[PDB]
Amino acid sequence: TLHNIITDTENVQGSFSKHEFQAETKKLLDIVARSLYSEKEVFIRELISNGSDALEKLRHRMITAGGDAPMEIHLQTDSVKGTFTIQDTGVGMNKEDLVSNLGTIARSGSKAFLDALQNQAEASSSIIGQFGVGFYSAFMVADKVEVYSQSAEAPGYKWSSDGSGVFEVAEASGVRQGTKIVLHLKDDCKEFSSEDRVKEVVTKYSNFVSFPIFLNGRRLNTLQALWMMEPKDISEWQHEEFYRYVAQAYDKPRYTLHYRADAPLNIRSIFYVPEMKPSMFDSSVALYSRKILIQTKATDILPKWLRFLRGVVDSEDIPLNLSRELLQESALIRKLRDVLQQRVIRFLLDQSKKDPEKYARFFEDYGLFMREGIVTTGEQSVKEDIAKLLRFESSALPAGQQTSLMEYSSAGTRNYYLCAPNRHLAEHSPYFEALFCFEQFDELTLLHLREFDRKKLISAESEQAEDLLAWMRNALVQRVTNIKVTPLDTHPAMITVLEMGAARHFLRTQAQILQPTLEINTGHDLIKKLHALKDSNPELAQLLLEQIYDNAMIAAGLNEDPRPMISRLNQLLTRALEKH
Amino acid sequence: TLHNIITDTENVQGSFSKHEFQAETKKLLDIVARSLYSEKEVFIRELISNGSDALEKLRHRMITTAPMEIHLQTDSVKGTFTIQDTGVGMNKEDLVSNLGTIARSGSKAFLDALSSSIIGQFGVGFYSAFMVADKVEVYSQSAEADAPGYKWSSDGSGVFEVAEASGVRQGTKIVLHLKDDCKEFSSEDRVKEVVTKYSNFVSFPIFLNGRRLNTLQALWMMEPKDISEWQHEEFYRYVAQAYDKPRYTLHYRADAPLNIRSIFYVPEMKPSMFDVSRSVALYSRKILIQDILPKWLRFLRGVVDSEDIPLNLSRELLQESALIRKLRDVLQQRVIRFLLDQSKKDPEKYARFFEDYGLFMREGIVTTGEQSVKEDIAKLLRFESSALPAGQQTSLMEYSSRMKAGTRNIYYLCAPNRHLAEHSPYFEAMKQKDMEVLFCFEQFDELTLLHLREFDRKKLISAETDIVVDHYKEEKFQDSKPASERLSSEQAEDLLAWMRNALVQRVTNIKVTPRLDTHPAMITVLEMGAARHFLRTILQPTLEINTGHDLIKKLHALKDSNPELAQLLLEQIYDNAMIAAGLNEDPRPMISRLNQLLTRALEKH
């Protein structure tokens, strides 16, 4: 059935013809100035980053060949003339620099600058540009672009282009040291002559730019990149502020993890666990690089189960996509994710020690995420790492108290859980008579776990009544699957269930078959009464039977909402109080 | 107050010079190889699209015959990936011009207007081969003139050599000498994965290593009336990656505000409760792109194509998020209409759908800002009614249209089931009015109606709420029982006084109500729904008693004859009333109090 036409049949005949690749410049502009980014607004991000680079370069040159203005990014909107303007007080550009850097696509003076630095210099980690195309994103939104630039040298210039394959350059007077870029906005892009709009964009992408940013004379970016500062020299109130900002929330972080590492990768990061539990009516961690936003929802840096974390991750040597809203597929990113997952797990274990009470609450609220982690990830090594966070009750421990899976195993022991709705049902299991996982998805969780600690874990799964016994089976027909006697004290009866699967598959139903078994205490003065009132008062006996049964179901946690019984109970009480 | 440096002070001195834009060619090639596509694998998509273009160009010119296929071959030994197409090929000046020049697209200049089949556009996809390859060889036969075959060759150095060659078949063959880095693309299973993912709907047949791949019809682009039930079942299973079938299918086409070609399926399966806690493919020109639906419509599976969405150069991003919000709103409106239509066509089937997917409506209502969208979604909700018989579902619309002209509100009552609603103490009270009352039985119905607030400018008010408001109006309500069967005002006063002492710190108020019949008492709270919700993490509760009720009269009698029993009874009545109110905490602690009440009451029996 095979059909392949591919065959080694070709032979070159003759020689020569060496050619150089070329570039259709006019179309390449158009690509850059249109087809690169998801949203037009990104041109602000690009021009501010460029201005930041011009300031960073000035700062760096003055370390050594020191000189004397303030280092600032200024924005101005003109809604009437329909312009947007940005000015920096940076190194500026001479004529040669404008023709070269602005007039050549893919040429990056800032990349050249970066390559020539001592790799330890502070400018090494803060210069943003590398691709040599960002500036052309202005033509995304503008028919005319004007650049006024004064070098920090021994003549000011104006660079001008409509974005159609040509530009002009003339000498300019009255040009302040640095660079002024004026965009004559297109009709459909006039929203960028709106102050509120430009403000939105600056704070979205450029809020943590090193240098101060002014819009129409007013400072904006008062927030500092906490993730780049020394952990122990940050306050509790600053995290509170920063968390809220980056999480877009209004509560506190209940956990803060400030993780810096130069080690497997450059990592400057902060992670928060919200104080508030998430629920039925609901951002993630954001990815930055050199203080500039890449993704508000970082996709490939953390596992999926860790998405309950808010915060920030910034690497400076992470390979960026040309759009600067994506990462390139890389072994570094698959490692960073492995590193962050292990670091966050170690952090949460440390918290289960520092404050086991507090961790308990955190596992109530977010423990569903670990459970998901175990069921999803393929790596068996990792499944047992996440399983270190799980908490349950034990057969041997008391109620309301939990333990980790790593609580030893006590001699030969080489494998012991019963997933049940609640305590009372578990302690009365047939298969318990040989761990207590009361939470939902606990079964499915350990069923995917399969092993922990190389160890194992498998689903541990007088005669005066008789008439009464036989009578109740005639009243509660197809409600229970059996009725028996029991030696119970304060309770007239109790409800026990055999298969724990049958109890789950029943609470999800909002008769229902689960083969429930009702055990009766013939030492109770209610059962004693029931026996008598059987023949003495059949209609009162019926009411009292259904109550005792209902009561036992409630006490077993198999009747959470007793609304159905209230009318009938009221009737039993009046009948029962007829006497008094 | 202000600090602004920008001033209109720059003036041009003297003449200027004109310049042309230039390009750093080697660095642009670097960018395409290393920084343009976020995933290496899409070099396969780009080469296949390029080959598909060469075939459409041949077909077009073949309206002046030959076979028209795409061949992939993977040499694991030699570390080689090959693609051959039988299309229009290219001559020497075509090789030199189109392959040698970045951002040059033959498949663009070609567009003599009439097709919508051509994919090429940007002029860079071919160079995506250098993501994964040290060396690329191209063999191309122009198939036009007395034109020779040619071999184009490049190591990715910014240089390429061209010689004329023999035994070059009609079309183009591209050989990638893969990098040790990416030898996965000489794996047949791996290369198949990539074709299935991006190029599964390509027009022409694609063979991998001699086996024809199971490419599909792009169903969403076709005439809705020509697609059989069974064709939808198959496509559903493909796009959802499912093993069941659709219960609803919406094939939606529009040119109107936006170009839309889409298919939406609602699975026959109930959504997994685990998957809800933890959806639709987006295409252009038969090639896959990667929210578009509102989050509450994430239960839909299916596909969306729109020619108005512009692609980015990487072909993985969309380019006007105002366009997407517009598209999202249009689809949401259409899906709502569609489901309303299905409610009318088959109400029985829609009950099943509502029962299995209702939670998504409720979510969408609770999480929307815009009231109009809340009310749009709320059209999908179904309830029972005090007007209609048991079992019969209704909507807010049918409630609205039943409303007498003067009536200003929509009354509801939330209970577990019909029987409890019908015999609810809160409904007994509403029955004294002649207003219709909606009956809502799902867990989060009340929460949904609190967030909904109003519908068609009519306020949503619970029975329980409206019962409290009627206190601060004229009672006006007369007891169901005559004065003969009730406690005298003097015995009632005495009983309240005693009850106030026995429940001191548990109730704000105790008072009699004439608005009950069957029940001894009830708990009222103005904001009952809100209270009920908050309890799903004391109050200011009011207990209202029925002095015609036998249990209450007996309570009044017991407080003097058997005070301990009287207090025990009162505790259970208040407990009972809190349960009926849906305000009870753990009911288990009471079971002990109840058993010791029951024994002591049944003690003279």
Ligand SMILES: Nc1ncnc2c1ncn2[C@@H]1O[C@H](COP(=O)(O)OP(=O)(O)NP(=O)(O)O)[C@@H](O)[C@H]1O
């Ligand atoms: N405001 C400015 N002041 C001084 N020089 C500038 C300014 N803006 C741009 N330049 C120079 O022009 C070059 C080209 O900028 P651009 O074309 O945006 O590429 P890039 O910003 O360097 N890299 P990217 O932003 O990643 O595309 C920069 O590298 C600078 O050397």
Ligand SMILES: Nc1ncnc2c1ncn2[C@@H]1O[C@H](COP(=O)(O)OP(=O)(O)NP(=O)(O)O)[C@@H](O)[C@H]1O
């Ligand atoms: N297999 C082929 N057969 C014939 N012509 C081809 C083939 N592959 C490429 N070409 C020609 O070379 C041109 C350049 O291709 P390429 O550089 O990939 O740009 P593109 O395919 O037009 N657009 P995109 O894929 O969106 O970058 C195409 O537009 C065709 O004219």
Ligand SMILES: [Ca+2]
């Ligand atoms: Ca440039």
Ligand SMILES: [Ca+2]
């Ligand atoms: Ca090209």
